[PDB]
Design a protein around this ligand. Structure first.
Ligand SMILES: Nc1ncnc2c1nc(NCc1ccc3ccccc3n1)n2[C@@H]1O[C@H](CO)[C@@H](O)[C@H]1O
Lengths: 111, 377
């Protein structure tokens, strides 16, 4: 059944998959710094300052993920575009898993 | 070179009349309008799209709606009312509002015209980047209901930005000029300007005699615009989701935001097609939401609001001491005037009269400002 048009949708989805990887990496970088910071080297007031700069960054990461979801939500895929449908659903779930990860951090620091 | 600037509450737009036609100028992101937003960070000042993009990350140091404050007294009913909504601090400085923020980790206060000057600086830089030439001369627009204090504060914003403000002109006047309604020969003309945006609705009646303008009346609704139409759709789909899935998405801010963004886009689709589809995977608790809405359903959901736009119109006519048959020209401005039903209700109200609507209703004010800037240059 494979149609040339599904190629166009599959390409769009791959580009979104790469964007998601770029953001996921920011989250991994964030988490690595967090451990270093919390590892108690700075005075408590300066540690708090650093943790709030990190909190602001996790909020940027959440918003970047939300923007990706909004872009994915503009797609309309026929029932027969099974490959495209599976890739769309799979990518949404991935993003939601990464948002759960951001929320854990967000709701632990700079309370 | 001379430019026209529509300095808007939520968005601004800049045009230039060159080689016999107005060019609306795209910003650095390619956008023909720019968010009237200013952000202060640890390292820098952001204006426009970049400032709007990072609202969520930095909402206390990101300023918008400076037009709701410019030239007003701190104790103005408008300033008092809006404050409770804005996440940024609005300070009382000897009876005049200033915005207070952190900027490169130091606390700073700005008057509204200072914030609007930053928006104008951006619009100036936008024109300069396009023209590849310095740009100094501008016409800048304001609402027809602006008093002396608001007009002077607007002019001052321009001056602070390094602009030679040739003239401050009313928004409905610029829209009339865009359509060349002042070039029409004959006797006195009565013009209705119907301006419906994302948040606000303004109606204005002007008379033009011999190319010369007068404001006869103003009316409107502070709490009516495209956001209100989106909300009616949002509530329609939240009820649908509860009906099919017996789950309440309304407490999940991210689900409701996904739905809301999809609804606003489907609305825009319904201005040119008679149906719109939406597919949101995993909207709430893993449940996919696939749905459609017809233009007629959308119209039905907003039937009171849409018909309601005729009340300010009637009001404006009473105040202008005119009969609806004494209106010669009607001009649509504002992005929500693209809705077919609104155009039909209005075209019917004026017993079948034609509407001036061919110029992009988001750009028409800038467009008239640019025509007049080249005239005054
Ligand atoms: N066809 C349209 N039909 C109904 N409403 C429309 C509309 N175009 C815009 N606005 C222009 C617009 C807005 C977002 C866009 C996004 C992508 C591409 C083009 C866009 N164009 N609006 C509403 O005007 C208010 C002020 O804009 C908002 O309530 C908005 O809904």
């Amino acid at each position: 059944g494979n149609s040339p048009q599904e190629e166009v949708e599959l390409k769009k989805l791959k580009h979104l998959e790469k964007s998601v990887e770029k953001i996921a990496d920011q989250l991994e970088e964030l988490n690595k710094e967090l451990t270093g910071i919390q590892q108690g080297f700075l005075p408590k007031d300066l540690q708090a300052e650093a943790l709030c700069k990190l909190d602001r960054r996790v909020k940027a990461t959440i918003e970047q993920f939300m923007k990706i979801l909004e872009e994915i939500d503009t797609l309309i895929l026929p029932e027969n575009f099974k490959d495209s449908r599976l890739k769309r659903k799979g990518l949404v779930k991935k993003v939601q898993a990464f948002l759960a990860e951001c929320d854990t951090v967000e709701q632990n620091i700079c309370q | 070179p001379a430019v026209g600037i529509d300095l808007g509450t939520t968005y601004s737009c800049v045009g230039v009349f060159q080689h016999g036609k107005v060019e609306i100028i795209a910003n650095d992101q390619g956008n023909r309008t720019t968010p009237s937003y200013v952000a202060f960070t640890d390292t820098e000042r952001l204006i426009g799209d970049a400032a709007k993009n990072q609202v969520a990350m930095n909402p206390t140091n990101t300023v918008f709606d400076a037009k709701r404050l410019i030239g007003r007294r701190f104790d103005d009913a408008v300033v008092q009312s809006d404050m409770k909504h804005w996440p940024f601090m609005v300070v009382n400085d000897a009876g005049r509002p200033k915005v207070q923020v952190e900027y490169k980790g130091e606390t700073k206060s700005f008057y509204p015209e200072e914030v609007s000057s930053m928006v104008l600086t951006k619009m100036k830089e936008i024109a300069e980047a396009y023209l590849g030439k310095t740009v100094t001369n501008a016409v800048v627009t304001v609402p027809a209901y602006f008093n002396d204090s608001q007009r002077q504060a607007t002019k001052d914003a321009g001056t602070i930005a390094g602009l030679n403000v040739l003239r401050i002109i009313n928004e409905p006047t610029a829209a009339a000029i865009a359509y060349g309604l002042d070039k029409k020969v004959g006797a006195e003309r009565n013009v209705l300007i119907f301006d419906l945006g994302g948040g606000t609705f303004d109606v204005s009646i002007l008379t033009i005699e011999d190319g010369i303008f007068e404001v006869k009346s103003t009316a409107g609704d502070t709490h009516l615009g495209g956001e209100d139409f989106d909300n009616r759709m949002v509530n329609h789909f939240i009820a649908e989701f509860k009906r099919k899935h017996k789950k309440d998405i309304s407490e999940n801010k991210r689900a409701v935001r996904r739905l809301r963004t999809a609804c606003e886009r489907a609305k825009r689709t319904l201005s040119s097609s008679t149906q719109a589809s939406i597919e949101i995977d995993s909207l709430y608790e893993g449940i996919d939401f696939y749905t459609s809405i017809t233009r007629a359903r959308f119209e039905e959901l907003n039937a009171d609001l849409f018909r309601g736009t005729l009340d300010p119109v009637e009001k404006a006519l009473r105040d202008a001491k005119l009969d609806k048959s004494q209106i010669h020209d009607i001009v649509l401005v504002g992005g929500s005037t693209r809705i077919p039903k609104i155009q039909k209700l209005l075209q019917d109200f004026f017993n079948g009269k034609e509407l001036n609507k061919s110029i992009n209703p988001d750009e028409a004010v800038a467009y008239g400002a640019a025509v007049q800037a080249a005239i005054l240059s």
